[PDB]
Symmetry: C3
Subunit: 428 residues, 3 copies
């Protein structure tokens, strides 16, 4: 399949991104658990108790039973509103983290995809290098037979074909592990992909660096998260400061008490005290609580929260600095990648006419086969180095979007258009 189709099938299955989602999903649900203390708490208690008097109570015994429907309600507790506020903020943070992890699926799928396309290019060039050496070995072994080439030109040539044989070997390996890379990320094995359409390919220059930098400062997810986090440390300072405020709660019960006495000093007290009591109370009440001095625990908590804010801020500076260097390095690299595709584009042309020369030269006395092998080897190196450099440009366009924070599905859709030929991932 093409880039799109691979990516899309990975979107639905990546246990890396699916976990990041379950983390986002929990953090948002946990807002609910944070809101809960601002709502009515409603419990039910029943307490059986048997007392047995001794000393000045030797002979007074009781079997008591109570039950109640208790209700609590926060009426003014700033600290509980703050927790709600923080859980919202943490959830927002988790969402930027998901946003970031979404992008990482894109960059990682593209990368593995091209790393396969390359493992393929490398193989097929290494096979063409092998095959080309064989034919040059069978003209250097049908000219040695005829006397006009030294035996050490054939021992060298055979030792050199044996190397391209061992190279073809650790080339498929590289390829095979590449599709294993792709499977882990993607969940699948592909019999064929779709390689970079070679003639229909031009590099597009990058936007000025100062524009990319400015766009990144508005939308780069690492930066947006450092900001949300500084925001969290500041709300956390208020939280420390809430421990100075007073709290007003409401309570309301409906209880039922059923005591009954026994023993000896109950057998004629006749004060109708030790007579069965059957109470029932409806209550509603307000507790007010004000902290006044707590060993200075509140102030130390506040100071801590403030250093935490400095730290959150330093972390933020670290973030701009990272976005700066990432956005620049990333611009720098796409430029060096364009100027590289150009140089290798020409070194292939050179390596080609340089080979063509020493094939004519060798079959007619002029230059050795060890002139023709090198010139051949040299060709296929520029051949590889080129197609490799192309892929890096493609992946470097994607890094620029990541550093920007805009890396999305469309960046993949466009890149899809620039490849077409279905290539096998398991060449015979």
């Amino acid at each position: 399949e093409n880039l799109m189709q691979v990516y899309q099938q990975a979107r639905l299955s990546n246990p890396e991104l699916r976990k990041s989602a379950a983390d986002r999903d929990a953090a948002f649900e946990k807002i609910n658990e944070a809101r809960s203390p601002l709502l009515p708490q409603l419990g039910l208690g029943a307490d059986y108790t048997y007392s047995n008097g001794y000393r000045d109570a030797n002979g007074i015994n009781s079997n008591a039973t109570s039950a109640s429907l208790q209700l609590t309600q926060s009426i003014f507790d700033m600290s509980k509103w703050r927790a709600l506020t923080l859980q919202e903020k943490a959830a927002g943070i988790q969402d930027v983290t998901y946003q970031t992890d979404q992008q990482t699926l894109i960059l990682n799928t593209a990368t593995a995809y091209f790393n396969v396309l390359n493992a393929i290019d490398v193989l097929s060039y290494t096979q063409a290098q092998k095959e080309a050496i064989y034919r040059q070995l069978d003209q250097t072994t049908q000219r040695f037979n005829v006397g006009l080439v030294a035996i050490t030109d054939v021992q060298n040539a055979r030792a050199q074909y044996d190397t391209v044989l061992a190279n073809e070997l650790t080339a498929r390996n590289n390829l095979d592990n590449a599709v294993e890379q792709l499977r882990q990320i993607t969940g699948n094995y592909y019999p064929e992909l779709a390689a970079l359409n070679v003639e229909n390919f031009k590099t597009d220059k990058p936007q000025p660096v100062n524009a990319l930098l400015k766009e990144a400062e508005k939308r780069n997810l690492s930066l947006l998260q450092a900001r949300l986090s500084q925001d969290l440390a500041r709300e956390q300072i208020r939280q420390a400061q809430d421990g100075h405020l007073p709290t007003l709660d409401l309570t309301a019960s409906t209880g039922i008490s059923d005591t009954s006495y026994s023993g000896s000093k109950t057998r004629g007290a006749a004060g109708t005290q030790y007579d069965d009591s059957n109470m029932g109370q409806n209550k509603v009440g307000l507790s007010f609580s004000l902290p006044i001095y707590q060993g200075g625990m509140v102030n130390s908590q506040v100071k801590q929260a403030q250093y935490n804010f400095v730290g959150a801020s330093e972390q933020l500076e670290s973030a701009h600095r990272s976005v700066v260097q990432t956005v620049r390095s990333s611009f720098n690299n796409i430029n060096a990648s364009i100027s590289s595709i150009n140089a290798y584009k020409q070194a292939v042309v050179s390596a080609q006419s340089s080979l063509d020369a020493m094939e004519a030269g060798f079959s007619v006395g002029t230059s050795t086969i060890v002139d023709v092998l090198d010139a051949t080897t040299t060709l296929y190196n520029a051949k590889q180095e080129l197609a490799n450099a192309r892929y890096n440009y493609l992946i470097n366009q994607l890094n620029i979007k990541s550093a920007l924070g805009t890396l999305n599905e469309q960046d993949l859709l466009a890149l899809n258009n620039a490849l077409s030929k279905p290539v096998s991932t398991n060449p015979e």
Copy 2:
């Protein structure tokens, strides 16, 4: 010493593995602390108090003294049985983690051991390469004297010996740091080891990949741990759900109260109220508590626990995917390693007869010393590349067992048998 003896000495001292053990030891003991709330709690409290009445109590004062032997007992508290259950599970997890760390000691000891054997092979070859160039330099300097070799053949040859001199230098360094690696891991320094017996060496083909894969899915420790962890997230969902259940505890005291009054309105009240009281109560009782509505805190806690379970599951998928690619890549690599030992086995033969030729050639005009140097350099490269590839196969056999989850002492015992010659780790 041999592989075995090194490993074994490291088993007894590795502070990496010894810590992992202390972690396992603590998690298991912590089961005890988790069981404790299901047992009887037994405290002792005595409270002296002095009251001093004012307002409608101006003149009523009291000095009271109480003490009690309190006892609590969980009778039905599902949440406390759950914690016990979870600490058992966490202990199990810690033990799979120790199991994993045990293996890592094995892979790490073997790796360092061969990294030394290689630093040694590389040195001794680099010494033989040095020594061989010296003798070829003293035949090219006893033929230059006699006129029939250009001075630039000797300037080239001396500049080239100078390089093998600098190579011998940054070869012994590599070696020395390798024994430092080994010491950190192992606690010791070895004057000699035991290198890979070179003639008594063949490669053994690996088991089919589909068999390894199937064996790994049953025993691979990383996988077993993802599973124990999914299990934990599920028990954790039940824990969230326990917050709907009621709790029944028992309590039992034996108190003693000693109040005594004073002030002015005690000096003739003659109601025998403000008379010294001396109580003593034996109690036993049952508290029952049922939550009814808690702001929906219990449900949000349950939903959270559920997303955690989704995540624990995605994590598990991630684990299969890792076991797949590890087991394949690892199979792939041992194969490419066998086919590699073969190719280098032959390139050494080639490089050898190719040298032999150009030594005869150079001492009789035919080929330069710059033909003889390269051919020599080339040999020693195959010489190294070979013994190096051998070690990689050995270490790759061990990676399969790790991916399998079976890496153990016997895998080392067998590998021990395939080495014998005691080699110095500090060559003069």
Copy 3:
């Protein structure tokens, strides 16, 4: 600017080190929050309550109001002293961590600085290599015109200049990203730096290894922290053991109760019970609490704390082992670095006279231009490899200081003296 001036400007702005500082600052302030429970806690509570009787209380109603100024004071609570003790210890640990991070700013600033100096050296050599090939190409293209040089000597020579052209390209990239590295760390961009004064340069042999090792065992920060941490685990064992001790607190209130009754069975009870009560109590009291059996929670907690200590100890052994290998490897490396600056110092001399020869040789028939290019290429490689090796020696001097735990500003001040020539970071 020079090394000093860069470093110093980074000291004032590094958000990596400024964060580490905010972490240290908080840990120390948090001692305050740990001391607080040992001080007086002073609150204020007022509780309005309305009761409404039913059953044996049908017709008894009350509106009650209370307020109090409560005070608590730990009189003997070992656990609270221990917390204070641990927070002190944690703060100490955070400070060793800051000490470590301080050093890392130094090593990291120096490294980036020299990595720029090197990206510069490499560029300027790559430019001199380019420029030298051009002139040799324009004598091989004004001798081909005159017939006595094959065309394949010019196709080879142009393909080889094209390579140094592409090398110059991915050289000024390397450089540009190096200053980006430097900016992230340092906060600035420098138009010029100051490179290693090349003639005024000698290597200084290192102190014997056994001395460095002994010095490191006394002052290496990683080791000091492992020790401080072992100390924490042991204090943590005492903390576990404190759960067996009894606790004695003091309390003091000044309350005010204002009950008032209503309903029907209050309308003539005439027992002056349901008459407005107006209490007021001054209290002072001592609570004593002794744990006796807590399900063996205290003992399991202690055993756990003890395994933690074993782990903290194993961790410590891991630390010596790390300091050993770091101090040795680091000594080893500076020596191989000296012996390296020497070998490359000579290979440049060789590569120079070897070039000089084959420039005379080629302009007068003797050796090809493909003899003159290689010999040239070879010179500039030793030229680079040399200046590169020099920097590594500088940075390796700094690693010894880190492994020692003495890396400080003076180590930089001295290194500053050994450079002087202001070099541009943006060569045209």
